Amino acid sequence: SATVYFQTVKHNNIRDLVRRCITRTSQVLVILMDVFTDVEIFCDILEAANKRGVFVCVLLDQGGVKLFQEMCDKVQISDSHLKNISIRSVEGEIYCAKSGRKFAGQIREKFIISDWRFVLSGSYSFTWLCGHVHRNILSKFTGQAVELFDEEFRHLYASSKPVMGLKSP
Amino acid sequence: PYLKEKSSATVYFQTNNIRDLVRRCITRTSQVLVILMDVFTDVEIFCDILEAANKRGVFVCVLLDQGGVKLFQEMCDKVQISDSHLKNISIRSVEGEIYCAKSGRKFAGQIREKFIISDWRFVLSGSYSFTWLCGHVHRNILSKFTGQAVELFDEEFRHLYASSKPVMGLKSP
């Protein structure tokens, strides 16, 4: 099945659906992200990983790695934090900037797979702005749709470089 | 048309097949084309819209995020778009809720929602923006919806449409 959620004006249901997806995950949580600076969502990851048994693997677009490391450093994330967490860098195809410098195309895909049961996917980025001021769309997917997301994750994973945490999913 | 069909969903991943789907969706629209967009600077996509609008009977309404009207306008001016181009095209401005920047200045939240409704038959939604970069270097996702699901996009459009300001072109439905 497939469901689509639109942001309500009064309250941010989009954020809540993401946080609920993470806080309710039992065993496995794989995430494809472009930007990750929102401390709170990472706290929901830490909780699932260290307070529950959840194995977390975050494929982050190479562009956001820097500000993500700054987030971690700010709240003093440790290797011990990441006993069950794996953050890997991933990047799009190589191209020439106008300066002649070679850059990596941005991974704009964003989705969350919980317990290999259902998938969340939409425009919501793990930033404070997305979860407070921006109007996003969000889609939920179950059944056969989850597989095409799985193969996407595996595909991207193979091309991914390790950044921090578990170096062996 | 969607109102008669059962609900369905399909997801597309990058192989540029995503752009093709987007363009193919526009070039195969027959009567009506509703679009919600955040950034519109790709002349080629706007040219596909001109074709559908003026060479076919297609009425095109585009809800563009206020934060992108500027560069959309520069695009039009660059290729010298006139009022005559837009006899059947309606570009309107829509903006998110109001909030305070750190500078104290009030700004409108961005509508990061991006979708296209073609002939009230099927919806394309995803990360693909109408910019050159998206169509050439970025990796996007694109989902297609048909049937009863489309209604939630229709209602979402109408909600946003009621909020929109006229910017350019035909000021009507």
CB B95 within 8 A of CB B68: no
* B143-173 residues labelled b (16+ CB within 10 A) or e (exposed): bbbbbebbebbbebbeebbeebeebbbbeee
Q: Do the Cβ atoms of B113 and A135 come within 8 Å?
A: yes
Q: Give the A-side interface with B, CB within 8 Å.
A: 1-2, 4, 6, 9, 92-93, 95, 105-111, 121, 123-124, 130, 132-137, 139, 141, 145, 148-149, 152
User: B96 and A134 in contact by Cβ < 8 A?
Assistant: yes
Q: Which residues of A touch B115 (CB under 8 A)?
A: 137
Residues of B in contact with A145 (CB under 8 A): 9, 11
Q: Which residues from chain B sit within 8 angstroms of residue A134, using beta carbons?
A: 96, 109-112
**Residue located via tokens 């009207």:** B69
Domain A1-169 in this protein, CATH class: alpha beta
Q: Which two tokens stand for residue A127?
A: 């930033």
d(Cα B93, Cα B101) in Å, to the nearest integer?
21
DSSP labels for B107-168?
EEPPB---EEEETTTEEEEES--BSTTTTTT-B-EEEEEEGGGHHHHHHHHHHHHTTPEEEE
Nearest to A152 among B7, B9, B13 (CB): B13
Query: Which value in Å is the resolution of this experimental model?
Result: 2.7
Domain ranges of chain A: 1-169
Interaxial angle between packed helices B43-50 and B17-27, expressed in degrees from 0 to 180 and rounded to the nearest 10: 20
**Does an H or E element contain B118, and which?**
strand B115-118
Specify which residues A32 forms β-bridges with: A59, A111
Residue type, A62: Q
Indicate yes or no: CB of B127 within 8 angstroms of CB of A109. yes
The Cα A78–Cα A34 span in angstroms is 22
- Backbone φ and ψ of B118, nearest 5°: -110, 115
What technique solved it?
X-ray
CATH architecture of B1-173: 2-Layer Sandwich (3.30)
Cβ-Cβ pairs closer than 8 A, A with B, add up to 92
Shortest Cα–Cα distance, B28 to chain A (Å): 25
The Cα B159–Cα A116 span in angstroms is: 34
Cβ atoms of B11 and A146 closer than 8 Å: no
DSSP B56: S
Torsion-angle region of A60 (φ positive above 0: left; ψ -120 to 50: alpha; else: beta): beta
